[PDB]
Amino acid sequence: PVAVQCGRLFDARSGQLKGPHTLLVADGRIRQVLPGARVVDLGDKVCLPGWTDLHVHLGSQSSPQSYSEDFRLDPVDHAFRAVGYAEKTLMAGFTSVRDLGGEVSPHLRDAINQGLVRGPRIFAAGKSIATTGGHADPTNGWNERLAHLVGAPGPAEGVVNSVDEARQAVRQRYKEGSDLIKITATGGVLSYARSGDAPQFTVDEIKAVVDTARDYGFRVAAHAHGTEGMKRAVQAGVTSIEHGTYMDDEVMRLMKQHGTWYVPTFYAGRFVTEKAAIDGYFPEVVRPKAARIGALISQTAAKAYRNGVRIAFGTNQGVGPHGDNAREFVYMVEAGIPAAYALQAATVHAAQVLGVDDQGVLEPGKRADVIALAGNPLEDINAVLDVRFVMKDGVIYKQ
Amino acid sequence: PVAVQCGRLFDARSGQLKGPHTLLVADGRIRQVLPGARVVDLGDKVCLPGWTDLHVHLGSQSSPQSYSEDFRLDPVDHAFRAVGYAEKTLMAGFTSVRDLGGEVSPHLRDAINQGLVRGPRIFAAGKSIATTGGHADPTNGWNERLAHLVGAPGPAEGVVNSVDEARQAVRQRYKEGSDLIKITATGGVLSYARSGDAPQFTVDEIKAVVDTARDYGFRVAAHAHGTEGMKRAVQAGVTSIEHGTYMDDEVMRLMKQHGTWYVPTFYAGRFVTEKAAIDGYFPEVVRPKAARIGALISQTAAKAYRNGVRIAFGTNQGVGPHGDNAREFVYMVEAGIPAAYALQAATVHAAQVLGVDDQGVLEPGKRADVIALAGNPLEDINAVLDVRFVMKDGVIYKQ
Amino acid sequence: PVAVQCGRLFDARSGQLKGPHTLLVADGRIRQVLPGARVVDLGDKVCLPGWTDLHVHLGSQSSPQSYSEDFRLDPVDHAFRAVGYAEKTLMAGFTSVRDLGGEVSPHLRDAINQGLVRGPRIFAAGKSIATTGGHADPTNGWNERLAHLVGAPGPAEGVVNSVDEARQAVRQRYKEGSDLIKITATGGVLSYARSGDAPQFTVDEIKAVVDTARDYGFRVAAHAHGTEGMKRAVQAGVTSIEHGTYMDDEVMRLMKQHGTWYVPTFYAGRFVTEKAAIDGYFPEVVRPKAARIGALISQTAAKAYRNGVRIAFGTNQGVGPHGDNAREFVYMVEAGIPAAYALQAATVHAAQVLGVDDQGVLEPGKRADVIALAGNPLEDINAVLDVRFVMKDGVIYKQ
Amino acid sequence: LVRGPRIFAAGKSIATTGGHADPTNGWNERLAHLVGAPGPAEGVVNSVDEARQAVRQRYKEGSDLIKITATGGVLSYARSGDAPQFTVDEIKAVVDTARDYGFRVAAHAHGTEGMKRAVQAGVTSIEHGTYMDDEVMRLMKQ
Ligand SMILES: C[C@@H]1Cc2c(Cl)cc(C(=O)N[C@@H](Cc3ccccc3)C(=O)O)c(O)c2C(=O)O1
Ligand SMILES: C[C@@H]1Cc2c(Cl)cc(C(=O)N[C@@H](Cc3ccccc3)C(=O)O)c(O)c2C(=O)O1
Ligand SMILES: C[C@@H]1Cc2c(Cl)cc(C(=O)N[C@@H](Cc3ccccc3)C(=O)O)c(O)c2C(=O)O1
Ligand SMILES: C[C@@H]1Cc2c(Cl)cc(C(=O)N[C@@H](Cc3ccccc3)C(=O)O)c(O)c2C(=O)O1
Ligand SMILES: [Zn+2]
Ligand SMILES: [Zn+2]
Ligand SMILES: [Zn+2]
Ligand SMILES: [Zn+2]
Ligand SMILES: [Zn+2]
Ligand SMILES: [Zn+2]
């Protein structure tokens, strides 16, 4: 057991900063919250619940050589890099993440759960599900020789073109040990393809995916830049929409009526626009899309917040450098979202998005994921960049 | 010809113990039953019809090395073990069995019918039919290298994901010489998978399987632990439900309305719970499921019997050691089922489940499958563990 | 322990019938022989060591449908037939055999050694080694479609065409669990090919096979009908020559100088010639060879015995019906070989051919393989057809 | 990226068919049929040219030295543990090819005959050496 003494306590359920409190931690869970057994003295720090990043890619990090290192590097090298990526993420203050694509992440989650390596609690989607020529198609851009040798991808590889193939793909992801399902409803900006906002799924295919995923207890996250694919995904019944660059009034109304969550990923847009002044960074097929679609997310997210769409915290890390996830708070506040709502989007709304109930608040019976900051973010949001204390499941990783 | 003199005769059609009788056997069939030509003197023994076990796996027997001996052993070694397994089963008093999975069993049935080896009369299902990642998926748990080399299984291997694939799978089982069809409606407890009670078939797929099987004269047996898969299988029209650990009131009502048979398999649950005090026996993926789902069958079976669900005899042997099938009678009686009903569930109800009419009773025109016991099971059910006489199709195998 | 009381004892080391003796058996070995503890009374029987058949095929038995049942039957059916074949062989009086081809036999040997099934002690060669189009080529006679699908066989299948391929084939047989090596030096009479006495191995290939086999402790047996292939195999240094239909003076001189053993297989020749009066029994490609080469073995074997070539006992059973191996004694005696030498060729000489030292004689420290006959074979060789007692490794199988 | 010692890696071991380092030892015939018979790219050699190709394949994959299994082992799924599994010519070919690329050869050997063959062919070190006798000791000293 251990008694943690917070100087100030942030109530995520309400959104207010309370006074001094003492946390009682035993068996990895919070047992008591008394206002005013080892002692951890944090009377000088603001004492917060652990953050959750709902959009990360722990198996990669963008670089000038990213597109070339897909035919030379093996998954073991990616696994060796993911160790440092995960340690940096956990030390930045994020005790839980949702991985939205990649085959190394389930193995990293299993290794972290066994105590082999240090990192956050990972909810992994595994392989993304796409159509032929879609944003997540694994053989996009290959020359005809390589495509001929490797064959046309199918449901086992995540590429579907009918209802039965979608059902088989969801079952294949369940077989491989996934926690949720990720689909690419439209085209993207970083893939080796032409379109970036065209509808790539039919409504029937998305409905089949959602219906199959509901049987296995999964939730579905949909990547969407264009309006028609976003509308189709929202009407089919997905749980969250990522990016959503070209959201309009009708999509906003449908999302409000359906209770869909929106994850904007400010950081990815800002990073890809800043990496445009640099002359050689992107292939000639990707650079126009990256110049066009980026940095239009900020206005869309501000409009969505003003219109009443529920917003949750996500960064799309793996485009940006791991361990720098907290600058998304500063980006969110700069766009007009209040600091308290920005902090709630990472604790209580993130738990709602994940579909769990044992995390997000410092209440009895919940997991003991506690962090502390030197300053107060409610007045200066830059205080999120200095984390002094990190605890996860009752184990202290940074003191 | 031969005249068998039973001291006491058990009437399976009614469930009562009659007085002395003389059986007249010729050409493998019973011709005459007279109350009060070679002579077989069994005046000291209770004279019964041969038993039928509706759930066996003659091609395997569980052991501490069971999971490893799937990449080292060939089917010929399994065939060499099945000879002793079948002889033990026949000597235990069971003249007929229903094999519910395995590729060696049809060959063993053909060999026994030709007189090459000794054993009971086998009704074989062959390969089980499942979905991707299902309980009967042959490549569950393999590393990605082996899965890549062997390819994704399809209907010829028994893995289906649509209506047409299910039709093709039923036709493939018919082509390979099967007598019935077996599907896994939910997950299991002994497979290398995560879920154990999730719905793995849609209603349309099960209906397609049942409709195709009806054309070829087949019956469908469904493995089911969870409630939703059990409900789907019952509504689609299967003939019997195996295990049924999480049966509730609605499933019971549907089964009573549809006339579905229930096979609980007490022995498998008792054996898997007893093999839990032993420290190392099961893989870490299987042991929680085996600790959770086992020994909950006894209360479910007792409740089903009290509610009026038709119950038939089955053991799931191959988990337990072959030749010990008769302890299921003692388990059945311990749970509250009367001894006479327990004996009827193996003779006349088993014949109804199989869909035959020439066995189960000692009536003229029926097969001459007669056994004898030293004691009386109606007062002491432990008398089923001492079989003195075994006859099958007019041939005496134990005297 | 057990004390066996033989009425008359045959001394294999000398070849004489001694007087009454008492055998002392414990731990599966003979411990004491005393002229003149349970008691086995065999005072009325001649007490002999167990016989060894150096040429059997326990995985097959020739029939009118033999050539068709290579595309319809699976190895499991052959395994189910081999159980009865092995029991018949053991009951005929043969406690040890050398299997000279077939993939089921190593598995049968493993099953017998574990006590699963009853049979003799098997020394198995596994897959035969041949060249392209050779007598043991597994795809001889297939239409071009099947040959195209299955591909051209290589060293892993037993087909070699160079020194390195022969080395790899010997290593592959060692990997699969073989006890010796079998090659086909010439063509055959029962295969689906044209030639029956042409040289199919070069001297270098046979020398490579012998040199590789010597490293792993193996002995080499060579199938040979024609003179040139027989000469090449003898000069390369094989241990035994089978059939040897067209042996001449030079081959006899080379065999005498090299110490090569000769196994004639009277029974196979007599069978394939008796099955010639029957109109339809053999394919039109095989029947001329079977009519020509058969029954010429008797004169060749008689000439070889007169010339001083060492002769050992073998039948080529699997062409003839299993369990009838002892008629080879009558065939041997009919050709002029003395009865005592015929009995020695199956006991003390067979052990020399196998390369073992713990069997063949009833001496202390040897295995307890004892059989008994009603009559005396030294005066009437027909007494070998009535075996009354069978013991193997101290276990009585027939009394 | 991670902490550890300085590693000199041999990569895939080089063996013969059924050898101690054979990657498909003990597999049932179905798995062996699907995966195919291993060759030089997998590290299984049966001639001089195959040994040369195997050494070149290890060089291509980024190895620092070469490891061969001269005899059988004790922890593999095989029968023999001290039988000679390489011929002298094959080991000489391996050593000669490895000398061109600056590699050294380490030989696994329990039995006496395989140990003698590896020592005479010119390997750098002998591992285990359970059944070493006087003649092998003299050859090693020389
Ligand atoms: C392994 C991981 C897989 C992956 C997947 Cl499945 C999707 C994305 C992705 O949605 N990228 C975005 C990047 C982006 C850029 C700007 C604004 C929003 C998003 C895109 O190209 O549209 C993505 O960026 C990545 C990625 O970084 O690599
Ligand atoms: C070859 C044969 C195939 C087979 C199949 Cl298809 C199904 C089962 C099976 O239903 N096992 C059950 C074992 C079990 C355990 C407890 C209570 C009920 C059943 C399960 O794991 O859910 C099963 O046990 C077996 C088996 O034993 O191996
Ligand atoms: C499975 C087993 C494999 C086998 C092999 Cl590998 C070889 C022979 C064989 O040598 N048969 C002889 C039969 C024979 C007939 C007459 C005189 C001598 C031999 C032949 O055809 O020349 C042979 O007969 C058999 C056989 O019977 O089937
Ligand atoms: C991945 C790695 C590969 C490997 C290889 Cl290539 C060889 C050995 C090895 O030589 N093992 C020895 C173990 C041993 C045991 C006792 C005395 C000497 C050696 C053997 O089985 O003969 C060996 O042990 C291992 C091993 O441990 O796994
Ligand atoms: Zn995206
Ligand atoms: Zn993404
Ligand atoms: Zn089951
Ligand atoms: Zn079962
Ligand atoms: Zn032959
Ligand atoms: Zn033969």
Atom of ligand 2 nearest to the CA of B59: 1
- CB of C289 within 6 A of ligand 3: the answer is no
Ion ligand 8, residue ranges at CB < 5 A: B 100, 316
Residue C44, token pair as written in the block: 């009325």
How distant is the alpha carbon of residue D135 from its chain centre? 22
SS3 content of chain B, % helix, strand, coil (to 5): 35, 25, 45
| Burial annotation A7-26 (CB, 10 A radius, 16+ → b, else e) | ebbbbbeebeeeeebbbbbe
Most ligand 3 atoms within 8 A of CB, residue of C189, C197, C275, C289 to mutate: C189
Lateral strand order in the sheet of A94-99: A51-56, A94-99, A121-124
Sequence letter at residue A149: L
A143 burial type by CB count under 10 A (0-12 exposed, 13-18 middle, 19+ buried): exposed
B110 chain-C contacts, CB cut-off 8 A: 77
CA distance B232 to B238: 10
C-alpha C190 – ligand 3 centre gap (Å) = 6
Neighbouring chains of C at 3+ CB pairs under 8 Å are B, D
Q: How far apart are the first and last CA of chain A?
A: 17
Nearest 5°: the CA angle B113, B66, B326 is 55
A84 chain-D contacts, CB cut-off 8 A: 1-2
- CB of C244 within 6 A of ligand 3: the answer is no
User: What residues pair up with C42 in beta bridges, in sequence order?
Assistant: C6
Identify the helix (H) or strand (E) that includes residue A211.
Answer: helix A203-215
**Residues contacting residue A231 through CB under 8 Å, at least 6 positions apart:** A250, A251, A254
A38 burial type by CB count under 10 A (0-12 exposed, 13-18 middle, 19+ buried): exposed
Yes or no, beta carbons of B79 and C80 under 8 Å apart: yes
Q: Which phi and psi angles does C173 have, rounded to 5°?
A: -65, -40
User: What residues pair up with B40 in beta bridges, in sequence order?
Assistant: B4
Q: Which phi and psi angles does A299 have, rounded to 5°?
A: -65, -40
Q: Which residue of C has its CA nearest to B81?
A: C116
Tell me which residue of B332, B350, B389, B319 sits closest to B98, measured CA to CA.
Answer: B350
- CB of B57 within 6 A of ligand 2: the answer is yes
Tell me which residue of A256, C75, C283, A320 sits closest to B104, measured CA to CA.
Answer: C75
Tell me which residue of A125, A135, A232 sits closest to A169, measured CA to CA.
Answer: A125
**Residues contacting residue D91 through CB under 8 Å, at least 6 positions apart:** D68, D70, D107, D117, D118, D121, D123
Cβ atoms of B313 and B263 within 8 Å: the answer is: yes
How many residue contacts between A and D have a Cβ separation below 8 Å? 7
Most ligand 3 atoms within 8 A of CB, residue of C57, C197, C299 to mutate: C57
Residue B165, token pair as written in the block: 């694939």
In the DSSP assignment, the letter for residue A126 is: -
How distant is the alpha carbon of residue C72 from its chain centre? 27
B73 chain-D contacts, CB cut-off 8 A: 28
| Burial annotation D86-113 (CB, 10 A radius, 16+ → b, else e) | bbeebbbbbbebbeeeebbbbbbbbbbb
Q: Which residue of B has its CA nearest to D31?
A: B71
Ligand with smallest separation from the Cα of C58:
3
For ligand 4, atom 28, the nearest C-alpha belongs to D75
Yes or no, beta carbons of D31 and B146 under 8 Å apart: yes
- CB of C189 within 6 A of ligand 3: the answer is yes
Yes or no, beta carbons of B74 and D26 under 8 Å apart: no
Cβ contact A–C (≥3 pairs, < 8 Å): no
User: What residues pair up with B21 in beta bridges, in sequence order?
Assistant: B6, B35
- Three-state SS letters, chain C: CEEEEEEEEEECCCCEECCCEEEEEECCEEEEEEECCEEEEEEEEEEEECEEEEEECCCCCCCCCCCCCCCCCCHHHHHHHHHHHHHHHHHCCEEEEEECCCCCHHHHHHHHHCCCCCCCEEEECCCCEECCCCCCCCCCCCCHHHHHHHCCCCHHHCECCCHHHHHHHHHHHHHCCCCCEEEECCCCCCCCCCCCCCCCCCHHHHHHHHHHHHHCCCCEEEEECCHHHHHHHHHHCCCEEEECCCCCHHHHHHHHHHCCEEECCHHHHHHHHHCCCCCCCCCCCCHHHHHHHCCCHHHHHHHHHHHCCCECCCCCECCECCCCCCHHHHHHHHCCCCHHHHHHCCCHHHHHHHCCCCCCCCCCCCECCEEEECCCCCCCHHHHHCEEEEEECCEEEEC
Sequence letter at residue A301: A
How was this one solved?
Answer: cryo-EM
Ligand with smallest separation from the Cα of C241:
9
Residue D41, token pair as written in the block: 């790219």
In Å, how far are B136, C116, C242, D75 from D29, measured between CA atoms?
Answer: 22, 22, 30, 21
In the DSSP assignment, the letter for residue B323 is: T
Most ligand 1 atoms within 8 A of CB, residue of A316, A317, A322, A325 to mutate: A316
CA distance A234 to A222: 9
B71 chain-D contacts, CB cut-off 8 A: 27-28, 31
Q: Which phi and psi angles does A386 have, rounded to 5°?
A: -130, 90
CA distance C258 to C210: 14
Distance from CA of A85 to the nearest CA of D (A): 10
For chain A, what's the residue count?
399
Q: Which residue of B has its CA nearest to A156?
A: B152
Nearest 5°: the CA angle A157, A158, A163 is 130
In the DSSP assignment, the letter for residue B219 is: -
How distant is the alpha carbon of residue C101 from its chain centre? 10
Resolution of the model in angstroms: 2.5
Substitution target in C157, C174, C210, C211 with the highest count of D β-carbons within 10 Å is C174
CA distance A385 to A373: 8
Cβ atoms of B37 and B53 within 8 Å: the answer is: no
In Å, how far are C123, C151, C388, D46 from D119, measured between CA atoms?
Answer: 35, 41, 58, 19
B155 chain-A contacts, CB cut-off 8 A: none
**Residues contacting residue A63 through CB under 8 Å, at least 6 positions apart:** none
Distance from CA of B69 to the nearest CA of C (A): 15
D35 chain-B contacts, CB cut-off 8 A: 149
| Burial annotation B89-127 (CB, 10 A radius, 16+ → b, else e) | bbbbbbbbbbbbbbebbbbbbbbbeeebbebbbbbbbbb
Yes or no, beta carbons of C107 and B74 under 8 Å apart: yes
In a 13 Å sphere around the CA of A198, the CA atoms on its Cβ side amount to 10
For every residue of A360-382, DSSP letters joined together read SS--TTSB--EEEESS-TTT-GG
Ion ligand 5, residue ranges at CB < 5 A: A 223, 242
CA distance B231 to C32: 73
C-alpha C77 – ligand 7 centre gap (Å) = 28
